[PDB]
Design a protein around this ligand. Structure first.
Ligand SMILES: [Ca+2]
Ligand SMILES: [Ca+2]
Ligand SMILES: [Ca+2]
Ligand SMILES: [Ca+2]
Ligand SMILES: [Ca+2]
Ligand SMILES: [Ca+2]
Ligand SMILES: [Ca+2]
Ligand SMILES: [Ca+2]
Ligand SMILES: [Ca+2]
Ligand SMILES: [Ca+2]
Ligand SMILES: [Ca+2]
Ligand SMILES: [Ca+2]
Ligand SMILES: [Ca+2]
Ligand SMILES: [Ca+2]
Ligand SMILES: [Ca+2]
Ligand SMILES: [Ca+2]
Ligand SMILES: [Ca+2]
Ligand SMILES: [Ca+2]
Ligand SMILES: [Ca+2]
Ligand SMILES: [Ca+2]
Ligand SMILES: [Ca+2]
Ligand SMILES: [Ca+2]
Lengths: 305, 303
RNA sequence: GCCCGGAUAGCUCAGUCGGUAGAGCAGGGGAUUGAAAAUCCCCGUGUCCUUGGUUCGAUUCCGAGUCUGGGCAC
RNA sequence: CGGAUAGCUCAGUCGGUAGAGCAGGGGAUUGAAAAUCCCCGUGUCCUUGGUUCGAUUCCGAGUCCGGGC
């Protein structure tokens, strides 16, 4: 049984992932899938570094523009959509090339996800209510009583995972620990994994500052103003929490100056890149490609496949 | 001589913030000194104190005029005097707060008795000037009043028109009439200027405050005024900062990004002229905007 | 020119009743199970502007100098 | 094929260190004042070589742009 093959092209923001995948498209029989939590949103184009129409004509990207910014996506939704796209592409005699910087998604796809309940807004509101009356420390104390192992790993000041560990208990009566000893299904594909990134760190920062000011001149403020104008989007939504968009949101709310927006936008982008690189340093199977050398990058992929 | 307080400062200075904190300590009644806050239904764009601030502190001379009605420094003078007389006859001290320095000037020093606007006579001067240019009218003024001709520049249509208007209605020239004076205040006044530490900080708070009001439904407000059908660019209300730019946006003359840019610029420039007024103002005590604690304390002492 | 204030970490600034210092932000490392561009954890780095006076000891109090921001004067 | 000069859009130096609008700064202010006016400039002329007493300018070469196959 020959396991079908796929390629992961990962990397930080401003690393030229999109550039290289579109070049790979010309010489390898591949179909591209976006692995990015922000490129999935309609009308969020400039700030997300979405490939434009002409780039999509030459190299179609699946899993772009499948959500309105008011709606939320998940590692799980990605996994289900990604698996289903990977079966079509394979059934057409092609090789799925998955490209993006959203590393939890790659991980969810590669090693599985344990089956668990999905979000419950009502249960989430309840927990948020109690945090506001008694602090998150009371909630972490509750988790100590029901799920000691989850309590130890999850820090008292991590609202997101604290809410998540309790939620799973409230919905099903079983603890997060209990459910996650059932393991995720591994990806039934032979996968070649690459991570392309700038030679050094000083240079990663330089390209990020450049790519931010590039966006500003591309009409980024206008894009975010349209979103801002709708009236039904708010900073608790994943899309508005995106890098660039969140700081521009403060700006449009009159909470910071233009220069403070610019400062905090770039910083958030550097902070993104840094966390993407952390994932990649601990990742297993990675072939490293040099961002500032796209020609060798292309040839290195070719001769590893 | 009964006493009074001037609290003067540029836009985005925390005037109202301080006024409401003074109202808790000294026995005092606020009077708004502002060419724009007089107008009904112009609330967001003008930085009008909200209905909550108005409950803590009553402000007089707010929302006394429909936007189709021109106010004037003389109308302010009459109303402020009449209101000071109530506050004084009621045991309290008038605290006039705001950023319209000509209005403060007229009140303290007095205006000389002249004729008011005659719109027909203004119609003829604006008609003559379109046919014969603004130099010929200036020439006309030099022939009959040399002194104002030397002071009023040929490219200043408002003051030139006014100088000629005073003569056309009266027969007496502006110089002749401005020889009689005010009518200064019969009050012992304590004058305060409240401004930020630096010009960069003032600019930055101005940008911020303008985006604040956009996000609070400023365009909807101006849409309502635009809805009416009787208001136009020659009215004092629609020439206000923010409102005038939003007016061009609503006429389809400029984009939204352009409206925002010109609005911020127009508000920076307003603030600049406001502190030009205050620099050199006699007897004024300066206060820092960013130090509200130290601010309040200096006022309490001086009085 | 005169008067007032500021000067301390890569940035904003707190503080040291005179015993040579710490917050946020930036930067570094790490965690990561249906919000992940999210949410968290851990770690840095000082001629305390210069100089003189008082002092056992001064970044701190005092004087002077320099740079910066205001006001006043033109 | 083109463009790179002020915070922004740009003009200009027949080779001798540069203006225009806008922004910005200073000023005036007598019934429209959030109005109406007046005054002032903001400089590694992208980098590097060549030619030159002198190059931002002329001529190469680099780099970034925006356009044409
Ligand atoms: Ca003055
Ligand atoms: Ca003066
Ligand atoms: Ca230093
Ligand atoms: Ca500093
Ligand atoms: Ca300090
Ligand atoms: Ca001590
Ligand atoms: Ca940090
Ligand atoms: Ca000594
Ligand atoms: Ca010393
Ligand atoms: Ca000292
Ligand atoms: Ca100064
Ligand atoms: Ca330019
Ligand atoms: Ca040119
Ligand atoms: Ca010449
Ligand atoms: Ca010049
Ligand atoms: Ca100007
Ligand atoms: Ca006068
Ligand atoms: Ca100069
Ligand atoms: Ca040269
Ligand atoms: Ca050249
Ligand atoms: Ca091209
Ligand atoms: Ca073409």
């Amino acid at each position: 049984a020959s396991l079908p093959k796929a390629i992961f092209l990962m990397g930080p923001t401003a690393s030229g992932k999109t550039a290289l995948a579109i070049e790979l498209r010309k010489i390898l029989p591949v179909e591209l899938i976006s692995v990015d939590s922000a490129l999935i949103y309609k009308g969020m184009d400039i700030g997300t570094a979405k490939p434009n129409a002409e780039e999509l004509l030459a190299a179609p990207h699946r899993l772009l523009d499948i959500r309105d910014p008011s709606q939320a996506y998940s590692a799980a939704d990605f996994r289900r959509d990604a698996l289903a796209e990977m079966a079509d592409i394979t059934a057409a005699g092609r090789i799925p090339l998955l490209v993006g910087g959203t590393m939890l998604y790659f991980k969810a796809l590669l090693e599985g996800l344990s089956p668990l309940p999905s979000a419950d807004p009502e249960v989430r509101a309840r927990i948020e209510q109690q945090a506001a009356e008694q602090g998150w420390e009371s909630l972490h104390r509750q988790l100590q009583e029901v799920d000691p192992v989850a309590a130890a790993r999850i820090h008292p000041n991590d609202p997101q995972r604290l809410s998540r560990a309790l939620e799973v208990f409230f919905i099903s009566g079983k603890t997060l620990t209990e459910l996650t000893q059932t393991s995720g299904d591994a990806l039934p594909y032979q996968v070649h994994q690459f991570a392309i990134a700038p030679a050094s760190r000083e240079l990663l920062h330089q390209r990020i500052e450049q790519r931010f000011h590039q966006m500003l001149a591309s009409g980024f403020e206008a894009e975010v103003r349209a979103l801002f104008a709708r009236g039904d989007l708010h900073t608790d939504l994943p899309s508005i929490r995106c890098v660039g968009y969140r700081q521009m949101w403060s700006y449009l709310e009159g909470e910071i100056s233009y220069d403070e927006m610019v400062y905090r936008g770039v910083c958030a982008t550097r902070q993104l890149a840094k966390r993407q690189i952390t994932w990649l340093r601990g990742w297993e199977g990675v072939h490293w490609l040099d961002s500032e050398k796209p020609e060798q990058a292309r040839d290195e992929v070719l001769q590893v496949v």
